[PDB]
Every structure is written in C-alpha cells, then in structure tokens.
Amino acid sequence: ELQKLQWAKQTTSICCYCAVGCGLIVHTAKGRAVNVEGDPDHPINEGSLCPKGASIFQLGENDQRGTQPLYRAPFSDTWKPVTWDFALTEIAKRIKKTRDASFTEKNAAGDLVNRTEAIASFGSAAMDNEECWAYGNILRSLGLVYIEHQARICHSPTVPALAESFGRGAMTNHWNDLANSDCILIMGSNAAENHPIAFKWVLRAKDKGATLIHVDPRFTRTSARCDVYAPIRSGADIPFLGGLIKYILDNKLYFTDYVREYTNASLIVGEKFSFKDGLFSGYDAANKKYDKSMWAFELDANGVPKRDPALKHPRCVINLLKKHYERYNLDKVAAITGTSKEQLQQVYKAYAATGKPDKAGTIMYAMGWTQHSVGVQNIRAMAMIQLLLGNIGVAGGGVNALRGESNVQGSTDQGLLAHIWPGYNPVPNSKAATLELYNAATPQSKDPMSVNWWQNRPKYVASYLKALYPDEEPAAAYDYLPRIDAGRKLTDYFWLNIFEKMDKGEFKGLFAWGMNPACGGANANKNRKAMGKLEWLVNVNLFENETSSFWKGPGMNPAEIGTEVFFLPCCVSIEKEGSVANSGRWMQWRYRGPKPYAETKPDGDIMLDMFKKVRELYAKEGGAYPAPIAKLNIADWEEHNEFSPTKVAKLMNGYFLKDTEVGGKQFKKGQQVPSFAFLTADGSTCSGNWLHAGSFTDAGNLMARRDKTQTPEQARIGLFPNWSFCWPVNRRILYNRASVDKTGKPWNPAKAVIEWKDGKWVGDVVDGGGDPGTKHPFIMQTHGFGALYGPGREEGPFPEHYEPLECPVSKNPFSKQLHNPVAFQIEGEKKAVCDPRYPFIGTTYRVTEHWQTGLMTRRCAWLVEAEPQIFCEISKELAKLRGIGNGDTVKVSSLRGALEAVAIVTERIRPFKIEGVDVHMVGLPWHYGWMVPKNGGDTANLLTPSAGDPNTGIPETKAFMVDVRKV
Amino acid sequence: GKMFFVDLSRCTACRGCQIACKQWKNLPAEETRNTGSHQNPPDLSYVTLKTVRFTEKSRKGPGIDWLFFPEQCRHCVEPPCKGQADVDLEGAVVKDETTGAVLFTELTAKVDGESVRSACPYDIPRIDPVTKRLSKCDMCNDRVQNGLLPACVKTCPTGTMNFGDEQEMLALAEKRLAEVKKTYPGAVLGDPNDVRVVYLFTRDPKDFYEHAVA
Ligand SMILES: Nc1nc2c(c(=O)[nH]1)N[C@H]1C(S)=C(S)[C@@H](COP(=O)(O)OP(=O)(O)OC[C@H]3O[C@@H](n4cnc5c(=O)[nH]c(N)nc54)[C@H](O)[C@@H]3O)O[C@H]1N2
Ligand SMILES: Nc1nc2c(c(=O)[nH]1)N[C@H]1C(S)=C(S)[C@@H](COP(=O)(O)OP(=O)(O)OC[C@H]3O[C@@H](n4cnc5c(=O)[nH]c(N)nc54)[C@H](O)[C@@H]3O)O[C@H]1N2
Ligand code: SF4
Ligand code: SF4
Ligand code: SF4
Ligand code: SF4
Ligand SMILES: [S]
Ligand SMILES: [W+6]
C-alpha cells in the first residue's frame, strides 16, 4: 500500500485550466485533498497532465487562498472579514438600489427595453456550465445588457467567422480526431505549450505519416517537434492565406466535386458586388460601415440564390474568388509576411496536397489569428481554404479553433456575451417589440435540399422563456428580458466600450466575477483608473488579486478612491460538482473530491443565495419593474437550500411542462426532453439551452458517461461517442454529411466519419437527417452551403489584407487602404503607425507553466519556480542594434504604458524582411501582475491597444508597436 | 528489473514531469530568477530530482534545433555511486533486486558526499548543505512496487516517457530508434547496456547536456 493514498477517497474530476478537458483523480482525506494526478481511463489525456494540471494540488491546498468574504468600505486601506449573511444581504441591497435608480422601461425612441445600463458584469469561463447559465439569467432578470466574459477577448471572432462559413461557431472536430490527419498546420497557435495533451494526438498523426507544420513569428516548443517551421510577421496572416487560395486555384489542387456540390462556388453574386483598391461596394466613410445589401446573391423567382453548376458564369462565387486573390502572388506575399518564397511554396505544396479526396488537412489556431482588427477575416480565409480542399466534415480535417478556458465553450453557449442568449439565440434589439417580430428575423429558405435548421428557433426561444418563466406564456415572459438599441453598432455593448464608458463614470457597479480585468483587459492602465469610478465592485475569485485591489497598484491612492469593493472567495474545481464543455463540445461531469476550503463555497451557491435575498427584498420593499425577478423558476435549481448542479443541468436539457405529442411520438408530463428535435413553441416544453437537449434525458446524465467502447467504424477515428456527451445531439464531427459523396460513400473509407446502409447512417451521429444526396450538408446555413463568399461580415465577403492599427509599414502593397476601413477604435486614442518612438512589432503570448493573468499560477510555487519573472524575447540582430545582453533588464514601452522585463536573446526570433527592410519584433508574456510574486513584474496589457475587430470588438493584443531599451 | 525508455524526439519540454515529481513527493520549490532562459531550476539540487534542460543549437535556415533533456538518475545496472559510498559505510546506497532501483538512504550524510557525486558518470547526486544527505530520483520505487507508473512517466502526454520490464523496454527502444531515424537520422540510444533510464537523443547526446552519456 502507498502511505500517501492509504486513508483517502478516490473521485474523478476535469482539469480547471485549458479546454483539452484532461481527466484527473483526486485522493481526498476521509477532509482535504492529499493527491491530484491524471485519470488513466480518460480517452483524451490517458493519465497525462502538463505542469498546470499536475500542480492542481498546490492550487487547491494553497495557504494564500481566500478564507471568508472580505469587505472594503470606501476610501479604506484594508479588508475586514465579514460573514456569508452580511456579504450577500448588503450586495443584494446595492444591486436593488442601483437598478431602481437607472432602470429604463422605454428608450429615447419610445421602444420597450426594460434594462439597467448602470451595471456591467465580466465573467466567467472558469465557472461550471450549470453556474454560467444561472449567472446570465440572474443578470438578465436584473435587466443587465452589459454581460461579457473571456470569450469577447478570446475566440469571439471564431463564432461569426465559422458561422458565416459553416453555420456554427464551434471547433468542427475534437482532440482525439487530430491523430487521423495527413497534414497538421499549426498557425496562430502554440499548441505544444497552450494545449499540451493535444500533442499526444498530433504526434500520433505523425507516427502514421502526417506532416506537422508550425507557422509562427517565434520558434517555440511546438516548432521543435514539427517537420516544417516558417516565420510569419504578426498581422500578416491574410497575405499568407490569400497566397494559398491563389496557389490552390492556379495549380488546380481544389477538391472539384466537393467545391461544386457542398460549397457556394456555383452561386451567382448580384451585379452590385464590386471591390477596388481595398474597398468593397457600399462603403459609408462618414459612419465607418458598409451597406451589405450591395453584396446580396442573385435570387431566382422562389428567392433561392441562382446557381451555375458548370461554374462558368462570371459572377459565380468561385470565379469572383479567383479574381480577388489573383493579387496574392508569391513575390508580394513574401514581401509583406517576411516568410521566404521557398518556405511559402514548401508549406503551400504540403497542405494543398490534402485537396486529394482520401487525404485530410486540419488547421489548429487560437489567439494568433483571433486577437487582430482582421480576426474574423483571418479565420474566414482558412475556412475558405478548408472548403476548397474539401477538409470540412472529414476525420483529420476541419477547423480546430482551440478554445481557451475549461468551460469557455460552455460559458459562450450560456450567452455570457452582450449580443446572445443561451444557445446563440440573439439578445432582442429595441425594434423586436414582440416574440413574433423576434422570430421573423430568422431567414427562411425555399430550396427543398436546404434543411435551414434555425427555422426551429421559435421552439428554442419559447422553451427557454418557459425554463425561466414557466407560469407565463412565452409571448408574455418575452417582455421581462432586457433589449439593446437597434440604432447602435453591437460593439457599443462589448468589453472595450464598457471600459471607455466606465472611464466616463457611466457605470455604478461592476461584477469582476472569475476574471482579472486589471491584468486581462487590453490597455490595462485605462481599466485600472476607470475602475476607480465604480460606486461598488464585486469580485468572486480564489485569491486576492490585482482587480480586487486595483485601489493601491502602481500609483493608486485610497486618498482619491471611493469603491465599496466586496470580495467573495469561491471554491476550486475539485471542491465542486457540475459540467464543463471542452473545445470539442464534450460536456464532462466532475464530482466533489474534498469539501470546500475555509468556509468558502461554489459560485452557484453564492449567486443563488445572493439573488434569493434580492427576490426577498423586492417581496418586502417596492422598486422598479420587479416582475422579471419575482417570477424566475429558481426552485428547479435547488435541492437542500443550495445550488443543485444536477437539477440545473436537467432544466438546461429541459422537460415537458405538460403531456405532449411531438414528431409522431407520445411524451408524458414531467419527463426529460430526449433531443432539441422534440422541443415545441406552444409552451409544452421548457429547455434552458436547446444545445443541452439530449445531454440529461430519462436514460440519465449522458455527460457522466465514462464508456470508451466503440464500434470498428468509430474506433478507427476515435469518436468515443459513449464518453460524456457533446452538442449537438452527440455529433462529434460537425458537417459530417460533407465527408461522403451524394450516394453516402465516404471520400476516405479508411477514416470514414459516417457511412450509409440498412437505410441508416453508421459511425458518428449524422449532422442532419435525410437519405444520401437529398440535403445540402451545412444544415445551420440558410442556403445549406459552405460559404467561400460570406456577405454577413462587417468588412466584406472575402478576406483582404489590412495592416494592424499599429504597424511597421506605411503603404499596403495590396490596396490604398492601409488599415481595416470599419475597424473598432475609440475617438482620441493614439496609434503608432511607423512612429519613430516605437519602431518594433509588439506581440503578447503564453508559456506552458502559467495560466492567463497568472492570478492562479503566480500563487503556485512550482510554476513560479519554472517561470518566476516577466521576460522579453528578442532576436540576436535586435539585441545587437539596441546593445542588449542575454539576461539584462530592458524597458518595453508603447503609447499607453511601459514595464521592466528580463531579456531572453534567442535565435528563435529573427528579423522580418518586409519590403527589402528588416523589421524587428518584441515578444512579451502577459502572465504577470504587481501583486505576486516578488520581482515577478506587471501585466503586458499596459502596452496593448483598446482597438480591434469591427465584428466582435476583440482587442489587437497580438500585433501593435513598442520600443525596447536597456536599463 | 524495470527500465525507462525516454524518447526525446517526442518531448515538448512541457515540464509536466518536473512538476509531477515535486507534487508526488511534496518537495519544496527553489528560489529562482530568469537570467535569459526558460530553464529553471537551472540545475538539479537537494530539493529538485528532475529539471528539464533547454539548449539552442544554430541550424542552416529558419528556426533552431531546440534540445530538451528531462534529467534524472540513470539507476545504473552496476552503480558506481554505491561502489564509492560502500567504501565509507554500507547501507548509505542500496539496490532493489526486484525493480533495479538505486536508492540513497539518510546514512549518505555519514559518507563522503563529494566522492559519491564524482563517482557518478552522469553528475546526478546533490548534497543537502545543512544535513549533508545525498538526494536524487528514487525511480518512484514505492509506486513501482505498488504496481503504479512513476509520477513523471504517467504525467507525460507525448509518449516521450515509457516504463516497464527490461526486455520490453530494450525491444521498444530498438523498434522506436528505427522509426525515429526516418525523421532524425543522427538518433542514438544513451548507454543502453549500462543504465535503466535509456534516453533516445535526436542527435549528439552532448548537445542535450555535457553529462547526457558517460
Ligand atoms: N500554458 C497555457 N495554456 C493555455 C493558457 C495559458 O494561459 N497558458 N490559456 C488558454 C487560453 S484562455 C487560450 S485562448 C489559449 C490560447 O492559446 P494560443 O493561441 O496558443 O496562445 P498564445 O501563446 O497567446 O498565441 C499562440 C502563438 O501566436 C503567435 N502569434 C503572435 N502574433 C501572431 C500573428 O499575428 N499571427 C500568427 N499566425 N501567430 C501569431 C505567438 O508567437 C504564439 O506562439 O491557450 C489556453 N491554454
Ligand atoms: N495581451 C494579451 N492579453 C490577453 C490575452 C493575450 O493573449 N494577450 N489573452 C486573452 C484571453 S484568450 C483571455 S481568456 C483573457 C483571460 O483574462 P481573465 O479571465 O481576466 O484571466 P484570469 O482572471 O487570470 O483567469 C480566469 C480567472 O478564473 C478564476 N477562477 C478559477 N476557478 C474559478 C471558479 O471556480 N470560480 C470563479 N469565479 N473564478 C474562478 C481564476 O482565479 C482566474 O482569476 O485574457 C485576454 N488577455
Ligand atoms: S492545462 Fe490543458 S493540457 Fe494541461 S492538464 Fe489541464 S486540460 Fe490537460
Ligand atoms: S512530461 Fe514528457 S513531454 Fe513534458 S517535458 Fe517531461 S518528458 Fe518532455
Ligand atoms: S546515475 Fe549516478 S547516482 Fe544514479 S545510479 Fe548511476 S551512478 Fe548512481
Ligand atoms: S521516477 Fe519518480 S523520483 Fe524519478 S524523476 Fe520521475 S517522478 Fe521524480
Ligand atoms: S478563453
Ligand atoms: W482565452
């Protein structure tokens, strides 16, 4: 017997760090955790953990962690340990008061909005799926519109980028499936450091003949294990990708039958579409926007976009595609990327080889592509390349957008963003006066092969309103939830504008709930100051941090700060029950190992007790529009005067509120909805999230399944369909109808995802019901096609190269437009465009050993041991030019701030040859903050600009300009 | 006896093994600072039984050869560390005949620590400056005797770390070397007939670390 584990209880958990979703085993003293290591039975990690997962014991049994809630009275220099009862009652008062004062029944136009604009909320992908959904509905029942989290400043561009392209915003395949690839391109990702267990499956791909390619400004621990490494200048992705489009078309490396049948190659674009010198048609200079109606397809009499299946018509998408990317020749791409013409051709040849029907190429990307003013268009370009090579829907193919936090997929799914309810049903605008007008926005299709599954939205919105308000008719309950103004850009309600408004005193109360915006928000100085102008900041986190203690950071004085900061110390993942949705949409149940530390509790128990006291206060006192608060179905969340993850999960899935007949099947009242297929609009069904419909059925909790048993067909691509549950309805690989010909025969029989026979689909769950060749394969698309031409995006239906808002070149070689013509910027804010003061490319990125702002990992001695201080990675050429020695203290400065870092001088960074001139970069980690540890350093976000993508408002944290100088 | 096969052609220097060693044993963290490298702790010590060494070798064209060496006791088949310690006091260094683990006891405090270290071809032993006890990798001998993998082997996501019986691992080592040569033609096994920690190097073992091989 091993002494250490002899007297302890063994439970399963899921890692609280990255979205790989590795299994843990927690040994608990029969009652604190004595050991935490990997779960050898988990099909993703097989017992493996990176240093973050391997150190979860040091996090969970940490002596720097929050015991009992602290209260900071205004202008104070210190905390005071208060009780649960004080903390939740006083806060429930503060919410009620601030709401009552600023609650808007009708807007300036006279339209019903029923919202509070004085309260904002940030967070959090760190919370369980059950808690995330509860939190959003609580904030919305309180009338909040300014509801954001990690997703905004992470993969927010991925959602519209892939939804435009394929009809869903999620990672198309999953981790296990990478092993099936013939060519793995890792670009705008450092997967070996930031999704380490992913390289188990990347290396298994290579074992079976796959070529591994890393394209990155820096040579990384990923690059060390790849067959081909190529450098790329930060912000130069579209040139590279536009170059590969041209390359594929010229050399006829596209998958012809796939392109003709399954993409919108054949659709006829209207005559009003044009592009000249970096501007598409319909450009409005005065309002920094485009008239998208100029980009509309030519429609037949039935309203179905016209098609030329011979692909000969000059306004066919494929022919307009050839025309747009003809300017992206090897000489010009080389000149603007810094990537040699030889390496472009090497990478182009290797990846375009997967255009072959029985060969699969996949892309692994994350913040390298998203954190740009062209974030959406970066991703669009690669989605278009995958459609040309027929890599969407196939095993070892797809677009593997690597999600960040353990449950950022989940937290996005639960609509903790300003523009979406749970299940990607949009937040109503002021002109959606009724539920019928809301549903009327959903585009219809008169193509008999187009499934157009979003036509089912009325059933999901009605079942959602039933989940929240089960005694009200949906049409009635619709009036309770707040609405944004139709007149505004969406980006007015997003992160960067929420902090600009906070910096004008337009907010009273912020919830920094499982986020550290003092270090995690771009342009951190602005944020730290702006937060001074809150009347009450609430912070729910594991440790005291830079956010919860902003009032004393580099130059902060309680002499001039009046924020009633409340600090509510929460449980860690291993002390909590619930689910977390990983990058592949795998919804994984985890259990309580230890009891909670120092009388602290889960967010679900916090927020439910907190809101309950509001529900009680409004039952006693008066106050503005109290109907949304009183009527909330909250008893369905509970079992023993505490949050019931198990019951909240069953509500999300949903159950019949009465006896119903749906899809030629009889259902009894009270029993669970077996899939979103059986939801109704008439109030017969509730469902907190239609995506969760089928996750928790009568059969039990499918998220809790630990079954690695597969069929032969499933086993040769590693679907593991019996392990946990993935939305939608256990479709492990999205768009899998595209993996077969119109007879139902796999393109790659060796690696088949689905196969037709016995009049049914075998293997993965078919993504869209119907016999072979009777439906278009992208069921969530209006027209049913993979969109090469995507006219829904803010800056055009094709990706076009625009330099970062702070760039090292003065002239775009592709057009007369230097920057994104509709880019999100704030009026006044400065930009170093070839400024002599800031001549070097600035970028921020991660190391394996630290997590996010480092709030969690800067408290863990073993991770500080490995990476104790902020560093600054520079080439030998730049080190020479600035007289910097390896290990020297350097000062890195931008227009927005400056910091000190240890210089890592390395051959892993080299000059970028941009227009015959050598351009130098400065790399920084953003894992550090003033609070801990000693000499650790501050956030790199002191340097980062508060501008970026016009679609999603993601800040440009991967490409700006800086100076570096020796101290 | 037992054997590790360490395929460095698969190592991403994640340092999962470095943290996993300290977590299992509940070892303290060293005081460290960045001096222009990701390597930390910079060396093995009384409290650090495994550290991943980072070495950058210049290469013809873009990128480098980045060489990662998760260093540990080789648990030698005929350990010279025991030969030297036994000169001063038998029972300071002992051998498990079932597993093949070479184990330092607290009696090492009463032998010539400097001599025992110098006796190591791989420069593995480290002395506690206060108590003069010798510490290194103990092969997680307790886990192995209880039918578990060593903490650093179980944690490794890439397939770099492999563990099992001598015959099984030597066979795996020979088979893997043949496959790895197709990508890394200059690949070699480290002292495969002398040690129970058999490293596969992608090139000159000495480029990984000056004491990588004897
Ligand atoms: N170890 C670790 N793992 C993590 C996290 C962590 O903090 N630490 N956090 C998680 C989260 S929240 C997320 S979203 C993911 C993100 O994971 P990644 O996206 O891998 O994270 P980064 O290191 O920020 O960026 C990846 C790479 O982008 C490169 N890059 C920079 N600018 C550009 C550019 O303009 N173009 C291209 N093509 N590449 C560029 C950088 O050099 C870097 O190597 O990681 C997750 N996992
Ligand atoms: N310059 C630059 N800035 C960046 C990035 C970049 O690449 N470059 N990356 C961006 C990205 S992708 C992201 S995701 C954001 C992340 O930015 P933040 O979300 O602000 O980062 P952290 O707060 O460090 O990490 C999440 C928090 O979750 C908390 N937490 C853990 N478990 C729980 C729990 O059970 N409950 C609660 N309530 N909290 C919990 C942790 O303590 C931690 O503070 O930063 C962005 N910022
Ligand atoms: S951080 Fe990611 S890769 Fe590392 S153990 Fe956790 S889930 Fe796995
Ligand atoms: S855990 Fe494996 S891959 Fe990571 S550093 Fe150690 S040996 Fe290398
Ligand atoms: S590597 Fe050194 S310390 Fe370890 S068994 Fe061999 S001689 Fe002894
Ligand atoms: S075998 Fe055990 S003691 Fe040796 S390095 Fe690995 S985890 Fe540490
Ligand atoms: S994230
Ligand atoms: W993220």
Q: Find out whether B120 is annotated in a ligand binding site.
A: yes
C-alpha A573/C-alpha A578 separation (Å) is 9
How many angstroms is it from A631 CA to the middle of ligand 6?
58
Dihedral over alpha carbons A463, A468, A474, A478 (to 10 degrees) = -120
Give the closest of A4, A48, A55 to B157, CB-based: A48
**Do the Cβ atoms of B81 and B214 come closer than 8 Å?**
no
CA separation (Å) from B180 to A225, A228, B11, B14, B71?
12, 16, 13, 20, 21
Query: Is residue A340 domain-shared with residue A435, that is, in the same domain?
Result: no
**Are A50 and A862 spatial neighbours (Cβ–Cβ below 8 Å)?**
no
CB A946 within 8 A of CB A500: yes
Cross-strand bridge partners of residue A660:
A667
Q: Would the CA dihedral through A151, A153, A155, A160 be positive or negative? A: positive
Q: Which of residues 83-112 of B touch A (CB under 8 A)?
A: none
> How many beta-carbon contacts under 8 Å exist across A and B?
163
The tokens 């008239």 sit on which residue? A291
Closest CA relative to residue B190, chosen from B12, B9, B1? B9
List, in order, residues 6 or more apart from B133 with CB less than 8 Å away. B46, B104, B106, B108, B109, B127
For ion ligand 8, residues whose CB falls within 5 Å: A 154, 404
Neighbours of B121 (CB within 10 A): 16
Hey, is the C-beta of A568 within 8 angstroms of any chain B C-beta? no
Give A184 Cα–ligand 3 centroid separation in angstroms.
Answer: 20
Rounded to whole angstroms, the Cα distance separating A302 from A391 reads 32
Task: Report the gap between the CA of A211 and the closest CA in chain B (Å).
Answer: 11
Report the residue of B11, B45, B158 to disrupt the A interface, i.e. the one with the largest count of A CBs within 10 Å: B158
Residues of A forming the annotated binding site?
Answer: 15, 18, 22, 50
Tell me A265's DSSP state.
T
CA geometry: angle at B123 spanning B118 and B125, to 5°?
80
Alpha carbon distance B107, A544 (integer Å): 44
Helix (H), strand (E) at residue A925: strand A921-925
B200: Cβ below 6 Å to ligand 6? no
Would an 8 Å CB–CB cutoff place B41 in contact with chain A?
yes
Same fold, B2-74+144-208 and B81-139: yes
Q: Which residue has the tokens 């790849």?
A: A226
Sign of CA dihedral A644, A646, A651, A652: positive
The verdict on A22 and A96 lying in the same domain is no
Tell how far CA A377 is from the center of its chain: 16
Sign of CA pseudo-dihedral B177, B180, B182, B187: negative
User: Do A37 and B20 make contact, defined as CB atoms within 8 angstroms?
Assistant: yes
**Ramachandran region of residue A724, left (φ > 0), alpha (ψ -120 to 50) or beta?**
left
**How, if at all, do strands A283-284 and A279-280 pair?**
unpaired
Q: Report the DSSP pairing between strands B134-135 and B126-127.
A: antiparallel
Integer-rounded Cα radius of gyration of chain A: 27
- What are the phi and psi torsion angles at A628 (to 5°)? -55, -30
Residue A289 within a domain: no
Could you say which of A203, A340, A865 has the minimum Cβ distance to residue B32? A865
| Residue A348 Cα, gap to closest chain B Cα (Å) | 17
Say yes or no: CB of residue B124 within 6 Å of ligand 5. Answer: yes
The three-state DSSP-derived secondary structure of A120-132 is EEECCCCCCHHHH
A620 lies in the same domain as A692: yes
Half-sphere exposure of A154 (CA within 13 A, CB side): 23
Q: What are φ and ψ of residue A498, in 5° steps?
A: -65, -35
Tell me which of B74, B140, B144, B197 to substitute to probe ligand 6's pocket, judged by most ligand atoms within 8 Å of the beta carbon: B140
Number of structural domains found in chain A:
4
Cβ–Cβ gap B155/A49 under 8 Å:
yes
CB atoms within 10 A of CB B140: 25
- Report which residue type is found at A268: I
Q: Same domain, yes or no, for A303 and A187?
A: yes
Last residue of a domain, one of A674, A700, A720: A720
Coil, helix or strand for A510? strand
Which atom of ligand 6 is found nearest the CA of B140? 2
Give CA A9 to chain center in angstroms: 35
Angle CA A284–A287–A292, to nearest 5 = 45
Within 8 A of B24 by CB-CB distance, chain A residues are: 4, 35, 37
Q: Pick out the residues of the known binding site of A for [4Fe-4S] cluster.
A: 15, 18, 22, 50
CB B48 within 8 A of CB B71: no
Ligand 4: centre distance to CA B160 (Å): 6
Q: Is residue A208 part of a domain?
A: yes
A346 touches chain B (CB under 8 A): no
Q: CB within 8 A of A166, min separation 6: which ones? A: A172, A383, A392, A399, A734, A735, A778, A780, A781, A786, A787
- This entry's atomic model was obtained through X-ray
Report the distance separating Cα A890 and Cα A884, nearest Å.
Answer: 8
A196 Cβ closer than 6 Å to some ligand 3 atom: yes
Please tell me the distance in Å from A119's CA to the nearest CA on chain B: 41
- Per CB-CB distance under 8 Å, the chain B contacts of A847 are 38
Q: Yes or no: say if B177 and B137 are a contact pair by the CB < 8 Å rule.
A: no
Taking CA atoms only, the protein residue closest to ligand 4 atom 8 is B11
Residue at A343: amino acid letter = Q
| Chain A contact present for B16, CB below 8 A | yes
Dmax (CA) of chain B: 55
In a domain, A951, yes or no: yes
How far apart, in whole angstroms, are the C-alpha atoms of residue A765 and residue A761? 7
- What is the C-alpha end-to-end distance of chain A, expressed in Å? 56
In the stretch 168-197 of chain A, residues with CB closer than 8 A to chain B read 192-193, 196-197
The rounded Å distance from CA B199 to ligand 5 centre is 15
Alpha carbon A892 to chain centroid distance?
29
Q: Is B56 on the interface with A (CB under 8 A)?
A: yes
What sign for the dihedral angle of Cα A840, A846, A849, A853?
A: positive
Residue of A nearest to B51 (CA): A866
- Which residues of A are less than 8 Å from B20 in CB distance? 37, 49, 51, 54
Maximum CA extent, chain A: 78
Burial class (CB in 10 A: 0-12, 13-18, 19+), A504: exposed
Q: Which of A513, A48, A514, A242 is nearest to B159 (CA)?
A: A48
Quote the CA–CA distance of A463 and B40 in Å, as a whole number. Answer: 54
Architecture category of domain B2-74+144-208 in CATH? 2-Layer Sandwich (3.30)
* Nearest residue of A to residue B38, measured between CA atoms: A867
Strand, coil or helix: what is A456?
A: helix
Let me know whether A118 and A264 are in one domain: no
B14 lines ligand 4 (CB under 6 A): yes
- Among A4, A38, A910, the residue with its CB nearest the CB of B154 is A38
What Cα–Cα distance (Å) separates residue B125 from each residue in A754, B40, B205? 56, 18, 20
Question: Do B108 and B134 contact (CB within 8 A), yes or no?
Answer: yes
A108 & A202 share domain: no
Count of residues in chain A: 967
Backbone φ and ψ for A913, nearest 5 degrees, come out as -80, 85
Preceding residues of all breaks in chain A (C to N beyond 2.5 angstroms)? 30
Closest CA in chain A for residue B184: A227
Phi-psi region of B61 (alpha: psi -120 to 50; beta: other; left: phi over 0): left
Please report, for the domain that includes residue A25, its CATH number: 3.30.200.210
Compare CB distances from B62 to A871, A906, A910 and report the shortest one's residue.
Answer: A910
The answer as to whether A810 is a domain residue is: no
| A860: CATH | 2.40.40.20
B76 is in an annotated binding site: yes
A427 and A384 co-located in one domain: no
Q: CA B120 to CA A924: how far, in whole Å?
A: 40
Is residue B47 within 8 Å of B25, Cβ to Cβ? no
β-pairing, A889-893 with A960-966? antiparallel
Interface test with B, best of A25, A50, A218, A905 (most B CBs within 10 A): A50
- Domain assignments of chain B as residue spans, ordered by start: 2-74+144-208, 81-139
User: Any idea what the CATH number is for the domain that residue A653 is in?
Assistant: 3.40.50
| Same domain (yes/no): A141, A203 | no
DSSP class of residue B164 equals: E
Cα gap A407→A127, rounded to integer Å: 7
Find out whether A199 and A50 touch, Cβ atoms under 8 Å. Answer: no
CA distances from A337 to A230, A231, A238, A344, A841 (A): 10, 8, 9, 10, 13
Number of residues that this document lists for chain B = 214
CB of A941 closer than 6 angstroms to any ligand 2 atom: yes
**Nearest of A223, A197, A222 to residue A19 by alpha carbon:** A197
Here the tokens at position A924 are 């920084």
CA-nearest residue for atom 5, ligand 5, is: B75
Domain identity same for A855 and A932: yes
Specify the amino acid at residue B165: D
- Closest atom of ligand 5 to B74 CA is 1
HSE-CB for B68 with a 13 A CA cutoff? 24
Q: How many CB atoms lie within 10 A of CB A293?
A: 11
Cβ atoms of residues A797 and A273 within 8 Å: yes
> Is B43 touching A (CB cutoff 8 A)?
no
- Check whether B196 is labelled as a binding-site residue: no
Kindly state whether A222 is in contact with chain B, defined as any CB-CB distance less than 8 angstroms.
yes
Structural domain of residue A201, as residue ranges? 172-269+298-402
Spatial separation of the C-alpha atoms in residues B214 and B51, rounded to whole Å: 19
- Domain with A378 in it: what CATH number? 3.40.228.10
Q: Which CATH architecture fits B81-139?
A: 2-Layer Sandwich (3.30)
The C-alpha atoms of residue A196 and residue A49 are separated, in whole angstroms, by: 8
